[PDB]
Amino acid sequence: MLKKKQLTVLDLHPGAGKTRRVLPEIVREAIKKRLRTVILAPTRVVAAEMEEALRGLPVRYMTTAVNVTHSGTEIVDLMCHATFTSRLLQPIRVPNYNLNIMDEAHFTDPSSIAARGYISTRVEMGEAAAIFMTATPPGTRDAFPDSNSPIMDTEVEVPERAWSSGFDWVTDHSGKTVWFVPSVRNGNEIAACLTKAGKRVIQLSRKTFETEFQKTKNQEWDFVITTDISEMGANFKADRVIDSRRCLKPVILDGERVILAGPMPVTHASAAQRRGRIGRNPNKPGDEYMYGGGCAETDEGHAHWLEARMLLDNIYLQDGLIASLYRPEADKVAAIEGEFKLRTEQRKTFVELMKRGDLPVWLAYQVASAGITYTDRRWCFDGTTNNTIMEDSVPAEVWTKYGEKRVLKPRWMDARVCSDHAALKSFKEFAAGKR
Ligand SMILES: O=C(CC(F)(F)F)N1CCNCC1
């Protein structure tokens, strides 16, 4: 497994022990062979669980999610998938790791796809080994994989709005339920309906994940309402999963705007990971999985794969060479390697718009490639009338850094900057020059 030119997919079923049992064994062997090694966690929550499974082993934790006093003699580094890709893009030298281990390797965020592309290219080149740990590798067609204990799978209509009748089975349950919804806004409506019925609800999404996930351990709850982020190794002490089987798909239209299409079917990999939250305890058979739609290959033409290509085109590999996407996920985007390669100054602006600006990859690229500098926010106000961002059914407004009240009307419209109240609040701060 650990020899150069080898990429291994460790595809044991969800809950088979890849992280707590296999990962420590791989790490001890890597340390024995003096292999400079990187371990990639999808989230800060998974990073903290990894420190528990690897306690006593000399591992350098490159995350503030763990409070450890490093010895300085570690040859194994652990960081998030996003941190690995970010450090590659920044001028900082990243060691050329002999062994690259990615946990929850199915993660489809642009930075995780870019990390797989870079690592798999180094393996193809004969320069490194890699291990991708996931029950659901790219292109998997099985939404019902094995589990630690039998699961009751039931196809049923699942509410996507508040309801007054017709879904008694949802509230009649006396255990704990994890409910996957297509968006933060959809979860808000379902959570309000459940709270009005006397239920204790926790809501999870990308921006609130670490903070809110702690509540699943610190307090008694009846329902967790979550977006697709809980497919990335989040573990719950639950006996039921309710799965809408739906998600939002970012789509670039005519190369000039990004919309959030759908809700539409999830992939088989996503469905298998949502279901995989339960059936994990061999002593508790009969956990339930209620699903409300079919699966489809909705990663085809999904913006994240084009965004992954924008990131990889701006990462140095060797001379003018550019890393390809990991082969099983390379047909998801029709893109020419190198088409998004930016010159030195525009590349620095592109990195800063993502790192400090917190903009989506696609939007950061449109701004940097137009020759606009990081602090120049005139583009947030000079788009066409159809690009007006709305808040409470009225045009959103901000005070510019000049002290003028203007309507938010970006030159390039990316639906992700206003997908929920939290995102639009962050984008207003950016348009005003506050970061
Ligand atoms: O809340 C935000 C920041 C905003 F773009 F809106 F400024 N997000 C999360 C990161 N991706 C873009 C959307």
From Swiss-Prot:
- Sequence segments annotated as region (Important for RNA-binding): 3-6
Positions bound to ATP? L12, H13, P14, G15, A16, G17, K18, T19
Membrane topology of this protein: Peripheral membrane protein
Which residues get modified to N6-acetyllysine? K207
Motif, DEAH box: chain positions: 103-106
List locations, semicolon-separated.
Answer: Host cytoplasm; Host endoplasmic reticulum membrane
How this chain assembles, per its entry, is:
Forms a heterodimer with NS2B. Interacts with NS4B. Interacts with unphosphorylated RNA-directed RNA polymerase NS5; this interaction stimulates RNA-directed RNA polymerase NS5 guanylyltransferase activity. Interacts with non-structural protein 2A. Interacts with host SHFL; this interaction promotes NS3 degradation via a lysosome-dependent pathway. Interacts with host CEP63; this interaction disorganizes the centrosome and inhibits host innate immune response.
Protein name per the record: Serine protease NS3
Q: Which organism is it from?
A: Zika virus
The portion of the full protein included here is 1681 to 2115 of 3419
